[PDB]
A = this chain, B = another copy of it.
Amino acid sequence: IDPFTPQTLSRGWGDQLIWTQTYEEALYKSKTSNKPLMIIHHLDECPHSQALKKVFAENKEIQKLAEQFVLLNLVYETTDKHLSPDGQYVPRIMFVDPSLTVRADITGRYSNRLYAYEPADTALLLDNMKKALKLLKTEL
């Protein structure tokens, strides 16, 4: 019944983390865990990214989630217009329901905020992620 050894054997799944590449791979690594998949599709050609990357270093919350989840880096035409409708821009913090389904339509409280990726919007960014990895239904 009850567990044992109050100390996580493996210490930390993403104890180190890695530079993942290609969507599928990202999907599989998560698939093996049968858990929600988080993948921040980003690039650097657009100073825009450099914006989030700023507070990103201080927003320990972001990391905590970026390190314990999946990561993707794609700066070349590949995301077929079938994988994401308006997801044509850069800031594309996408998520995938347990079934490995890219539920990009996953919003939060103020769906009107997660549109203007402000240098300090980490609030919604974090809530969303924190919300994406949180189920709400199972039997109902």
* Total chain A interface residues with beta-carbon distance under 8 A: 15
Q: Is B17 a contact partner of A10 (Cβ separation < 8 A)? A: no
Contacting pair B25 A19 (CB below 8 A): no
CA distance A19 to B10 in the complex (A): 7
Number of copies: 2
Q: Which residues of B contact A14 (CB under 8 A)?
A: 18
Whether A109 is near chain B, meaning CB under 8 Å from some CB there, is no
Is the Cβ of B32 less than 8 Å from the Cβ of A25?
yes
Q: Which A residues between 91 and 125 are near B, CB-CB below 8 angstroms?
A: none
A137 within 8 A of B: no
Cross-chain contact A15 with B19 (CB below 8 angstroms): yes
| A positions within 8 Å CB-CB of B | 10-19, 21, 25, 28-29, 32
